[PDB]
Amino acid sequence: ELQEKLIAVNRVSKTVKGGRIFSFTALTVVGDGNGRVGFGYGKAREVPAAIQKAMEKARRNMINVALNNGTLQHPVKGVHTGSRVFMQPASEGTGIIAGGAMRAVLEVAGVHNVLAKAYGSTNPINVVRATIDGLENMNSPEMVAAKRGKSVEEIL
């Protein structure tokens, strides 16, 4: 039921007395096609093991997101370290207008319709984190009604 996308894999080095020890980092993200989403960032000497780790980590520490039907509930900004991200709810049919790692996380999240730009850095890791942050902070109408002591129709 869960869908999982390996966003990126990158070779990283550690210099030692002999020479360079190489290793691989795997950035993955998983989601159930609904609110729930989680990213994982694994590392191992070989690629498949590292992606396996990324999947494992993503599977835990997931996070829920309040989706109005296929899209978002309102425009939302999210940042992390360099990657600053804007994403905006959009009409059915438009699809996921987003670039790169961001796209991936959106798809697994089960959002189908967004207009979305990544300002600043586009370092996959940071940008996916920023996306997750923007999705988490985003609140729903019912939530704001509760926050504020009102009905949904009062807020419209």
Binding site: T94, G95, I97
Partner: protein
């Protein structure tokens, strides 16, 4: 302005059966439908994001037998129109005269239907229409003219259709060889495998 080459090759490349051949004989018998075309067929590495979108677009294109500028045209039209874009595009593609004919069952393949349209076989509301890209409109009756009514290939196409499932959005008569395009089809009525939203995204680059 048309693709004149091997058809099953396209099907193989796409992966699916595109219905580019009549359907008397199963596709698996005619070709290695699983294996991709060319020397390097058995090898099959995971495609890219752009690449999968591109393949989807190609699949649709190949299904209907249009060329790229014309599709881009269809897509822009759909975007202009109200409602879901990919759905609109699908409806537009369906509305094409030759496709309509193929759905009727006057052409074994869509290619055959296009050929019929070109050769002054088909009439729309009693007026001979020659353009395969002609967008047929609700309550438009579309028929074979009396000259082309004697052709054996037409009745063969009709038989093939009878084997094939009948579309709801149409109503065809096999004796009269005229069918009414009652309404523009719903997305549900069309095939589910087509990923319109990839196409949309592709051109929304």
């Amino acid at each position: 302005a048309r693709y004149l080459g091997p058809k099953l090759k396209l099907s193989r490349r796409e992966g699916t059966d595109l219905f580019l051949k009549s359907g008397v004989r199963a596709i698996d018998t005619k070709c290695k439908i699983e294996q991709a075309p060319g020397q390097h067929g058995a090898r099959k590495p995971r495609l890219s994001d752009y690449g999968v979108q591109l393949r989807e677009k190609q699949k649709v294109r190949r299904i209907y037998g249009v060329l790229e500028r014309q599709f881009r045209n269809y897509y822009k039209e759909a975007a202009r129109l109200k409602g879901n874009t990919g759905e609109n595009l699908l409806a537009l593609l369906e509305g094409r005269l030759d496709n309509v004919v193929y759905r009727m069952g006057f052409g074994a393949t869509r290619a055959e239907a296009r050929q019929l349209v070109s050769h002054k076989a088909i009439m729309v509301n009693g007026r001979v229409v020659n353009i395969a890209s002609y967008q047929v409109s609700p309550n438009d009756v579309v028929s074979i003219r009396e000259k082309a009514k004697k052709q054996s290939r037409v009745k063969a196409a009709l038989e093939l259709a009878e084997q094939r499932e009948k579309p709801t959005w149409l109503e065809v008569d096999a004796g009269k060889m005229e069918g009414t395009f009652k309404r523009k089809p719903e997305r549900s009525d069309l095939s589910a495998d087509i990923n319109e939203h990839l196409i949309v995204e592709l051109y929304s680059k």
